[PDB]
PDB file of C-alpha atoms and ligand atoms in Angstrom:
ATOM      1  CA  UNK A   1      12.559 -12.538  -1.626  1.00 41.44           C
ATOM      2  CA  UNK A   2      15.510 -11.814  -3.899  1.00 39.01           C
ATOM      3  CA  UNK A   3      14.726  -8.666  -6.191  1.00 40.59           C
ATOM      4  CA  UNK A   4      11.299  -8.302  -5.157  1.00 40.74           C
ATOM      5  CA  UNK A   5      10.057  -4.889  -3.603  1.00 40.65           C
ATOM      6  CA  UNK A   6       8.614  -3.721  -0.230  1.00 38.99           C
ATOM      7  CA  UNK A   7       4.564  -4.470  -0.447  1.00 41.78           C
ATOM      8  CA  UNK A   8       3.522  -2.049   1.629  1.00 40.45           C
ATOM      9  CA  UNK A   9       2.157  -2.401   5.408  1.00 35.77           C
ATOM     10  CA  UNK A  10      -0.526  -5.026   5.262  1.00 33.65           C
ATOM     11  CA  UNK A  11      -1.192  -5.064   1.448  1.00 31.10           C
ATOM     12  CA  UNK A  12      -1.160  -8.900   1.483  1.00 30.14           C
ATOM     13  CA  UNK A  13      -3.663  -9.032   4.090  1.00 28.69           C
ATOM     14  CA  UNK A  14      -3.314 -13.038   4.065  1.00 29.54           C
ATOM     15  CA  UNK A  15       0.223 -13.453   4.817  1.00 27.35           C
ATOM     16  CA  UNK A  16       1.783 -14.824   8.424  1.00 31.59           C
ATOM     17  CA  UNK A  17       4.606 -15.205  10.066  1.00 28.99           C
ATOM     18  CA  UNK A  18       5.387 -18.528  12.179  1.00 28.98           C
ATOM     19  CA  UNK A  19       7.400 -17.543  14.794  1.00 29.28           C
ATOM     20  CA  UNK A  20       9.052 -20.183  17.544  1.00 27.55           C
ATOM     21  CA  UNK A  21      10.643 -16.685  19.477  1.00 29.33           C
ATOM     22  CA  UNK A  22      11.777 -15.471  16.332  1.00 29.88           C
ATOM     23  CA  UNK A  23      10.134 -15.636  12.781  1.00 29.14           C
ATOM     24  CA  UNK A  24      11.347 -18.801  10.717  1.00 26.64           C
ATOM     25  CA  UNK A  25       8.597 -19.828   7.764  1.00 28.66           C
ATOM     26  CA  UNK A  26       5.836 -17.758   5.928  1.00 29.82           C
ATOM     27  CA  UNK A  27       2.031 -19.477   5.767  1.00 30.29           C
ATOM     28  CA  UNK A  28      -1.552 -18.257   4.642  1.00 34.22           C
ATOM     29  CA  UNK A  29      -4.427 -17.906   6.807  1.00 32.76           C
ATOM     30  CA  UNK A  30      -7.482 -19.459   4.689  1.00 35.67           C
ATOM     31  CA  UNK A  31     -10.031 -18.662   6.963  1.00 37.52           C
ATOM     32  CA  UNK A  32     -10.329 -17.399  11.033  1.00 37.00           C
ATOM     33  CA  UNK A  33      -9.114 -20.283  12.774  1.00 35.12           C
ATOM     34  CA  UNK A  34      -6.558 -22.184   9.863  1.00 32.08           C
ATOM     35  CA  UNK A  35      -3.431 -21.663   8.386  1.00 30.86           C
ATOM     36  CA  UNK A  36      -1.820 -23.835   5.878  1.00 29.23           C
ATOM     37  CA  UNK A  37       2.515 -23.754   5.198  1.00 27.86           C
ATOM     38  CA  UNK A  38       4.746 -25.668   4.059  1.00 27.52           C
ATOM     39  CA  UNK A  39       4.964 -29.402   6.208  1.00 27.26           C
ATOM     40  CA  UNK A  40       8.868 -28.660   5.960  1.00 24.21           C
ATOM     41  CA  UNK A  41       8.462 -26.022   8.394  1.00 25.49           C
ATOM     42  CA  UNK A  42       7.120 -28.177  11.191  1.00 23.76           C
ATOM     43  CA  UNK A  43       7.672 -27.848  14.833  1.00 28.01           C
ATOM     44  CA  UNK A  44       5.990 -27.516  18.114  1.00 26.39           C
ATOM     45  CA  UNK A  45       5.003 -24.483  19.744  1.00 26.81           C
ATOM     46  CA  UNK A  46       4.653 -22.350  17.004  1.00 28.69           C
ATOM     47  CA  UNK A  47       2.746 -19.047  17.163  1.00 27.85           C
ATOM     48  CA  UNK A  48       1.106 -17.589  14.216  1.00 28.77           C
ATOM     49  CA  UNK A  49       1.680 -13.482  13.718  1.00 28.59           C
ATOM     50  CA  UNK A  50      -1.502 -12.538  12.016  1.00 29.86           C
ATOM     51  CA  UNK A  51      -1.098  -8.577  10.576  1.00 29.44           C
ATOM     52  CA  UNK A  52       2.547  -8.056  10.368  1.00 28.23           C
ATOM     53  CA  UNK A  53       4.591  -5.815   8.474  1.00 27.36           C
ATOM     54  CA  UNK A  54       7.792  -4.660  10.199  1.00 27.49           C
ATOM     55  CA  UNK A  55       8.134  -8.300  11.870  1.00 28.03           C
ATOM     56  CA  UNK A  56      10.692  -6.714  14.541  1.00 28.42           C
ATOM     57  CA  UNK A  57       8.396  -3.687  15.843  1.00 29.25           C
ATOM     58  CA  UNK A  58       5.099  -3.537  16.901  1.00 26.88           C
ATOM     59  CA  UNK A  59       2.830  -1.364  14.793  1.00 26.53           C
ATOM     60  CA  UNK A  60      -0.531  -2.079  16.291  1.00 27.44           C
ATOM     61  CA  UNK A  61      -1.981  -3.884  13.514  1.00 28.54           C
ATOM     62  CA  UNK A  62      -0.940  -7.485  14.749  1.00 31.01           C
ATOM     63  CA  UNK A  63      -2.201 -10.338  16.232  1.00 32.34           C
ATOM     64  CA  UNK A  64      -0.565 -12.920  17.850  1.00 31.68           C
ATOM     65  CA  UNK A  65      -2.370 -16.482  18.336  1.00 29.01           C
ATOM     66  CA  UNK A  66      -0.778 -19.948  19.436  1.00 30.98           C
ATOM     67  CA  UNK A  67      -1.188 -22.805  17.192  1.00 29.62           C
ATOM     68  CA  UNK A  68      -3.303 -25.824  18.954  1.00 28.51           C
ATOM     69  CA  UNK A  69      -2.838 -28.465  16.631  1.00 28.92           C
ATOM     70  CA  UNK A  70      -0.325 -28.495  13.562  1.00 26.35           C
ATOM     71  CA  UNK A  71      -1.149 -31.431  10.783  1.00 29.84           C
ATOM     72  CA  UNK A  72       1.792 -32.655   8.019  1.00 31.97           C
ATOM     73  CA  UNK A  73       0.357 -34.235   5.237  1.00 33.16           C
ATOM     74  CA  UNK A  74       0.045 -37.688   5.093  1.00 35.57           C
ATOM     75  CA  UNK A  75       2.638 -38.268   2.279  1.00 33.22           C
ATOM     76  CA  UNK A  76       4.459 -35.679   3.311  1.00 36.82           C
ATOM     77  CA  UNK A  77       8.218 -36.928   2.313  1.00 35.88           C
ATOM     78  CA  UNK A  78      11.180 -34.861   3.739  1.00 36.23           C
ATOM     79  CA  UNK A  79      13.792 -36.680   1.785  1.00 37.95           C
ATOM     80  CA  UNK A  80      12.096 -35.363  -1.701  1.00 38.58           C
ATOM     81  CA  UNK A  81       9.946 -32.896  -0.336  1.00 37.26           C
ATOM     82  CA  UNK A  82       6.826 -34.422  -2.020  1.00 38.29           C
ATOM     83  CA  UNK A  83       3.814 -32.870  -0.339  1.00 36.52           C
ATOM     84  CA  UNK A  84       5.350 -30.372   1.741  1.00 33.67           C
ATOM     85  CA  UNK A  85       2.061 -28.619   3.087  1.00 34.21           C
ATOM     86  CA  UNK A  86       0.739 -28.548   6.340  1.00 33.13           C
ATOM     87  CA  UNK A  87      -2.416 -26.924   8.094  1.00 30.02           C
ATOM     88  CA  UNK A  88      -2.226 -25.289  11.224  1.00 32.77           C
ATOM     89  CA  UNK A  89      -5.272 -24.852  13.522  1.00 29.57           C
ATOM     90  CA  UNK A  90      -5.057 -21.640  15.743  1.00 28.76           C
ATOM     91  CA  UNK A  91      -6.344 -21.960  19.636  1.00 31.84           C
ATOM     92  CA  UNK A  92      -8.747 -18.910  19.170  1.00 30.32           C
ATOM     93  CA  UNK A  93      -9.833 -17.142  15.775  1.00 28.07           C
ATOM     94  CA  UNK A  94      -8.323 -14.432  14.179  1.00 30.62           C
ATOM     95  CA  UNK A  95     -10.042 -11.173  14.087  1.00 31.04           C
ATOM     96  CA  UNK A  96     -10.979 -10.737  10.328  1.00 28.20           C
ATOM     97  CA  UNK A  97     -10.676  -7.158   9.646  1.00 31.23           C
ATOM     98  CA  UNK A  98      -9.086  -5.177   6.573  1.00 27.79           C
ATOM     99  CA  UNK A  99      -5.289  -6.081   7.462  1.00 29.64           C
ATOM    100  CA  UNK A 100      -6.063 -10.018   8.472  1.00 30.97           C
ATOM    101  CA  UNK A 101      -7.876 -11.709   5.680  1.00 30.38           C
ATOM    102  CA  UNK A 102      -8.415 -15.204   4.381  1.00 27.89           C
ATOM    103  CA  UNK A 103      -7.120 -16.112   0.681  1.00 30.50           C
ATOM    104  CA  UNK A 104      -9.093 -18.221  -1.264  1.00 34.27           C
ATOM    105  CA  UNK A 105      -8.392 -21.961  -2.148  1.00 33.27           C
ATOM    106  CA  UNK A 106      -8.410 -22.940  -5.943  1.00 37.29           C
ATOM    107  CA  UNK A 107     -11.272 -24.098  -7.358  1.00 38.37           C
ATOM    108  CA  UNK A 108      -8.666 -25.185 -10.383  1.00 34.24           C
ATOM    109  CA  UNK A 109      -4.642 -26.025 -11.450  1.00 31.61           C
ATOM    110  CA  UNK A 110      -3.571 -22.472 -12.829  1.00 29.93           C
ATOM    111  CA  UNK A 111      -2.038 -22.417 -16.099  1.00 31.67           C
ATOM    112  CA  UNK A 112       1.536 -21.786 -16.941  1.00 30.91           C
ATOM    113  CA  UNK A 113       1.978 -17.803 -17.761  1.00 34.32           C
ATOM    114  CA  UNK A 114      -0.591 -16.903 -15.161  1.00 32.22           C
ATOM    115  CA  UNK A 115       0.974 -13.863 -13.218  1.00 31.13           C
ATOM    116  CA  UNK A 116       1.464 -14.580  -9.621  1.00 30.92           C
ATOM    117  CA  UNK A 117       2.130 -12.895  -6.424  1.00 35.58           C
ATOM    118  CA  UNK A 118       5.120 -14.310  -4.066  1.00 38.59           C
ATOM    119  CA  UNK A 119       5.682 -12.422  -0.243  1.00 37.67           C
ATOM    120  CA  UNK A 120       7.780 -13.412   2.460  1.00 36.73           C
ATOM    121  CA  UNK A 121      10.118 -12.154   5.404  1.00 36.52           C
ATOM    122  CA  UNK A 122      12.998 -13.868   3.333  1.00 34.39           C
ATOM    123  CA  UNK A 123      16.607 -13.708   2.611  1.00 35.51           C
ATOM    124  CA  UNK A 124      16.741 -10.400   0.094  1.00 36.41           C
ATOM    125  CA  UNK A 125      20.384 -11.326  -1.490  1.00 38.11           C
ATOM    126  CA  UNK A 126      21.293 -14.023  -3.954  1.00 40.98           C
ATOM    127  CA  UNK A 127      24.941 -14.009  -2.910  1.00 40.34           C
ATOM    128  CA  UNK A 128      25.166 -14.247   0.893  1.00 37.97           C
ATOM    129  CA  UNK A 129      22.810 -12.534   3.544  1.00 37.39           C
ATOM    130  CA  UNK A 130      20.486  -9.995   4.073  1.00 38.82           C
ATOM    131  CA  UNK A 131      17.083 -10.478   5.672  1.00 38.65           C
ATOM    132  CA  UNK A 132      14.251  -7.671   6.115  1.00 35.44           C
ATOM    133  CA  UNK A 133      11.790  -6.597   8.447  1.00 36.41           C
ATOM    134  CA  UNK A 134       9.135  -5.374   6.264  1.00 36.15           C
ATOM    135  CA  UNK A 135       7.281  -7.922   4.050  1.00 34.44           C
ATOM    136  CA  UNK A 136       8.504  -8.584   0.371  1.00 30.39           C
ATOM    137  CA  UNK A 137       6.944  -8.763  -2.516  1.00 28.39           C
ATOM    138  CA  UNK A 138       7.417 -10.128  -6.282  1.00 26.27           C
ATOM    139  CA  UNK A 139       5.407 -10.983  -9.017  1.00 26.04           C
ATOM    140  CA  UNK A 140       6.621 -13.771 -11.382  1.00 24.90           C
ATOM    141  CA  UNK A 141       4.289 -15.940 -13.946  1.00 24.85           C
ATOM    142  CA  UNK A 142       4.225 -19.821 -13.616  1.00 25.10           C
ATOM    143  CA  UNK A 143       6.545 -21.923 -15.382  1.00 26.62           C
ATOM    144  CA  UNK A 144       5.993 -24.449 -18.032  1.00 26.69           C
ATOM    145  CA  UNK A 145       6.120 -27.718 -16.683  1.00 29.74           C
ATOM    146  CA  UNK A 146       9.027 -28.678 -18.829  1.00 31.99           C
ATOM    147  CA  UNK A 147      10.975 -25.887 -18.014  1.00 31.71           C
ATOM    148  CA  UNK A 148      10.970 -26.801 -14.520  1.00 29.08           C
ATOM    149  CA  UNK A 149      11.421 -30.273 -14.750  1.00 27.82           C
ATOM    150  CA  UNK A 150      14.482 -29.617 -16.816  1.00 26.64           C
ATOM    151  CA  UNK A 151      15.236 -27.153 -14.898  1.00 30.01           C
ATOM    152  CA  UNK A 152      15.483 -29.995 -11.529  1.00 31.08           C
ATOM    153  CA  UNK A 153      15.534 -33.522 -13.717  1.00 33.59           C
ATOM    154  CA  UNK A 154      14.716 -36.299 -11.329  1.00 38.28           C
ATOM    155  CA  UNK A 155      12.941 -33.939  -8.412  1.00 38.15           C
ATOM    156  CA  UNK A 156       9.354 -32.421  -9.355  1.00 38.34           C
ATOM    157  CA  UNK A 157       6.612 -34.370  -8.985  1.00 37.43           C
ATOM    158  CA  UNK A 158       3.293 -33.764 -10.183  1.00 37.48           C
ATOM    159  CA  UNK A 159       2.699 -31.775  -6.728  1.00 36.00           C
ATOM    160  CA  UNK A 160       5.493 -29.473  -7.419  1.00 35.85           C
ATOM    161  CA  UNK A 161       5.671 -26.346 -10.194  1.00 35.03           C
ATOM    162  CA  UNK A 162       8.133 -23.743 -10.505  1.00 31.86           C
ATOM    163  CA  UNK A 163       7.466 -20.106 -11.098  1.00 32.77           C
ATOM    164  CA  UNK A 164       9.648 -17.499 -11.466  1.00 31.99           C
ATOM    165  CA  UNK A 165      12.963 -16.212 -13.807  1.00 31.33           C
ATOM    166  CA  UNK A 166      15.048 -18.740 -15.823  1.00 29.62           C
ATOM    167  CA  UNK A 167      17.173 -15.809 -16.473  1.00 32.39           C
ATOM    168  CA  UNK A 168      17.180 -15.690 -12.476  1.00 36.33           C
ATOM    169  CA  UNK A 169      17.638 -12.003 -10.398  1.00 35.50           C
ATOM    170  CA  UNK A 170      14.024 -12.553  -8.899  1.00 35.74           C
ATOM    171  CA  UNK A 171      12.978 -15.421  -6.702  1.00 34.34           C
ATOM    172  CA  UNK A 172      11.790 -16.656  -3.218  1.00 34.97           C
ATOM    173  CA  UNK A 173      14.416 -17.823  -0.478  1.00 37.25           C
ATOM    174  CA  UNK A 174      15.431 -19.227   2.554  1.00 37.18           C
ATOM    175  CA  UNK A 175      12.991 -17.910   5.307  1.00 36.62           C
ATOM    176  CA  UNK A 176       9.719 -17.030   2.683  1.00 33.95           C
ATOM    177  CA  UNK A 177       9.016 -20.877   2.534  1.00 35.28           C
ATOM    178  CA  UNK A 178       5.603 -21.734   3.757  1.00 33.24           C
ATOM    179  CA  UNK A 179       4.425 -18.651   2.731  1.00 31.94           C
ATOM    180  CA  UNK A 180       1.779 -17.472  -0.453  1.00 32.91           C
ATOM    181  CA  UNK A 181       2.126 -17.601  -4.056  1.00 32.95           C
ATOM    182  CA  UNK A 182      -1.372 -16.607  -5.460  1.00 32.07           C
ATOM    183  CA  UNK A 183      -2.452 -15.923  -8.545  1.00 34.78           C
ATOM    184  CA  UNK A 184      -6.221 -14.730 -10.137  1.00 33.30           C
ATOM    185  CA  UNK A 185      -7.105 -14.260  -5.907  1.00 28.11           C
ATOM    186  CA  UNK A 186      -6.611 -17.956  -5.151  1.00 25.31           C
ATOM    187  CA  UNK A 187      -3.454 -19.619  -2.973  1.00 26.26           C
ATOM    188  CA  UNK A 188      -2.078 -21.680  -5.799  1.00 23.02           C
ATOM    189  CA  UNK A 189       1.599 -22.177  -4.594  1.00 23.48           C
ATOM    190  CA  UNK A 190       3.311 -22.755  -1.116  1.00 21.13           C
ATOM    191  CA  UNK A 191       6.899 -21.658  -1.155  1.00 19.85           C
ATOM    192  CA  UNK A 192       8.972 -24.786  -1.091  1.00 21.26           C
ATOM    193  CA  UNK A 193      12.517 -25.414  -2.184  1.00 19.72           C
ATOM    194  CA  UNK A 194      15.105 -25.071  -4.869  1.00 17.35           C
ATOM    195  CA  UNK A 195      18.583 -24.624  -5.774  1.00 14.36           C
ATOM    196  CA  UNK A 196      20.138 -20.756  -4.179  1.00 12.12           C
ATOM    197  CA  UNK A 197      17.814 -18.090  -5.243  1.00 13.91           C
ATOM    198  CA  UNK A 198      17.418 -15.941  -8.014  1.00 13.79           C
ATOM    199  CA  UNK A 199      20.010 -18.037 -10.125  1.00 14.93           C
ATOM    200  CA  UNK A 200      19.920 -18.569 -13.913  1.00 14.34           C
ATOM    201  CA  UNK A 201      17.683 -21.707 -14.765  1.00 18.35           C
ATOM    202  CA  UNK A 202      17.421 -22.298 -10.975  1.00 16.75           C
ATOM    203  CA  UNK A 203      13.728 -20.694 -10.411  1.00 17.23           C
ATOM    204  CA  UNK A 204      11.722 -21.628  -7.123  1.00 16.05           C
ATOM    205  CA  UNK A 205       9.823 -24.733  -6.521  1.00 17.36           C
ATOM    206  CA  UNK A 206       6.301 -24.368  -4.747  1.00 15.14           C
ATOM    207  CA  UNK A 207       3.328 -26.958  -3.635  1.00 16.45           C
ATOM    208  CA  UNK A 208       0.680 -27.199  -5.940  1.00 17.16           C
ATOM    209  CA  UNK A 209      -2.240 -26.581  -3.757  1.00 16.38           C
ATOM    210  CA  UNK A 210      -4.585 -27.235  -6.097  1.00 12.02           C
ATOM    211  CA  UNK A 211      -3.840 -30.868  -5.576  1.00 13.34           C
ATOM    212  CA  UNK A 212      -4.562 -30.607  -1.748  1.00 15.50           C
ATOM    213  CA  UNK A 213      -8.158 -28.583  -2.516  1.00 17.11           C
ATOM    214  CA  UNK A 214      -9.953 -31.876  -1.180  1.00 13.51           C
ATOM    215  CA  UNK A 215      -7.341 -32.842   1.535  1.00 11.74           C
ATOM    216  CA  UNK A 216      -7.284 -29.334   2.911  1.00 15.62           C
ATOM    217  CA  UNK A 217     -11.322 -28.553   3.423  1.00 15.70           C
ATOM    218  CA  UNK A 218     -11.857 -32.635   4.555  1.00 14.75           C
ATOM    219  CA  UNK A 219      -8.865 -32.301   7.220  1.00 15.41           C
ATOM    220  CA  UNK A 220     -10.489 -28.612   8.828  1.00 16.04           C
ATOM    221  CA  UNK A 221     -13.812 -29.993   8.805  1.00 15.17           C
ATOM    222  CA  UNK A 222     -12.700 -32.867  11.047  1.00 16.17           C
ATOM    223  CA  UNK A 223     -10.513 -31.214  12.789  1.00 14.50           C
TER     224      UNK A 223
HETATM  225  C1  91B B   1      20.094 -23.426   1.460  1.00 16.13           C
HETATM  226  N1  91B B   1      18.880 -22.783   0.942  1.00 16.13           N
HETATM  227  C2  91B B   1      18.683 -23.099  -0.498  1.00 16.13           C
HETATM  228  C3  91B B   1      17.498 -22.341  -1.121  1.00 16.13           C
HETATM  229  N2  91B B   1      16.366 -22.438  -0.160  1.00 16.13           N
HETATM  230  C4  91B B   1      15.159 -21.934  -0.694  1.00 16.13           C
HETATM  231  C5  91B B   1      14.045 -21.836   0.130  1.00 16.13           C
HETATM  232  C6  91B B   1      12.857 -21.353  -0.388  1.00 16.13           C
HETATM  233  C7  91B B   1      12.775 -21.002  -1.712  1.00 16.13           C
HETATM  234  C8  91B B   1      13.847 -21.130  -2.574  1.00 16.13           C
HETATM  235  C9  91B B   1      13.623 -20.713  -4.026  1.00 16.13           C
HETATM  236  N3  91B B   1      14.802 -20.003  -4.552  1.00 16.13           N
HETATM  237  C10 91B B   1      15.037 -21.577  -2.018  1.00 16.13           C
HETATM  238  C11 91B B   1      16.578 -22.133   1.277  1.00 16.13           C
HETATM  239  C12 91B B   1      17.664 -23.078   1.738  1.00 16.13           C
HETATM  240 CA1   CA B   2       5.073  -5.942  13.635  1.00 16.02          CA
HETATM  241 CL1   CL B   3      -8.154 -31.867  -5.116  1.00 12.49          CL
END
């Protein structure tokens, strides 16, 4: 997170870190036994850190749970990143307590302007690299569809929207994607992509979960 502030130990109770022996992607636990991130963060053997603030020291808040099955979505495409989501099952549930907590699916598309909360273990600086150990936080409104697909002309699709700063300073980065953007209590945004971070009329590109409501709660129930 570039230009964001430090949340505060376990103040987004919701966030995880994937970590493959170090952390790599952000994702949201939506209830005790499911995650879901972004499919562009796939790989095997990932373990889901459940309760983490400093992500380099242990504070005695975490826990630590091995994924058992990991599922891309079906139209997943990396070339365009069109549908980058995935769901990841964990082998035993997570302890639900004040510090590990489910966010809520939508129930409905928010609307451009609606205030929104972005967190991740990301890179901090817009010009090279800094990355941080506690968790990150910013809040930055959704974008008018327009805006973003001016902003990226040929590349968002109607699973995509961008939220954020066209006068840039504040945005996501590399090492927050997967994780939460959620606005009015309800996970409406996976990090995803975009061009740097924090530039001007560059802001971040996130999943529109709303879109995968029915995909999401069909896939755990089989699953
Ligand atoms: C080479 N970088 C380019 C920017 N990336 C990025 C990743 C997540 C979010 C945003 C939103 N600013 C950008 C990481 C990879
Ligand atoms: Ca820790
Ligand atoms: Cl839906």
């Amino acid at each position: 997170i570039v230009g964001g502030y430090t949340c505060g130990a376990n103040t987004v109770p919701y966030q995880v870190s994937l970590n493959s022996g170090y952390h790599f992607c952000g994702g949201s636990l939506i209830n005790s036994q499911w995650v879901v991130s972004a499919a562009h963060c796939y790989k095997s053997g990932i373990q889901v850190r459940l309760g983490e603030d400093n992500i380099n020291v242990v504070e005695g808040n975490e826990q630590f749970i091995s994924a058992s099955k990991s599922i891309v979505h079906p139209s997943y495409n990396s070339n365009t990143l069109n549908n980058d989501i995935m769901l990841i099952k964990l082998k035993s549930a997570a302890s639900l307590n004040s510090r590990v907590a489910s966010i809520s699916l939508p129930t409905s598309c928010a609307s451009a302007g609606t205030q929104c909360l972005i967190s991740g273990w990301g890179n901090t600086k817009s010009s090279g690299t800094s990355y941080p150990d506690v968790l990150k936080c910013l809040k930055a409104p959704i974008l008018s569809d327009s805006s973003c697909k001016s902003a990226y002309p040929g590349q968002i699709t109607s699973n995509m929207f961008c939220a954020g700063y066209l006068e840039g300073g504040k945005d996501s980065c590399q090492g927050d994607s997967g994780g939460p953007v959620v606005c009015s209590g309800k996970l409406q945004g996976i990090v995803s992509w975009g061009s740097g971070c924090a530039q001007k009329n560059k802001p971040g590109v996130y999943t529109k979960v709303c879109n995968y409501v029915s995909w999401i709660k069909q896939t755990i129930a089989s699953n």
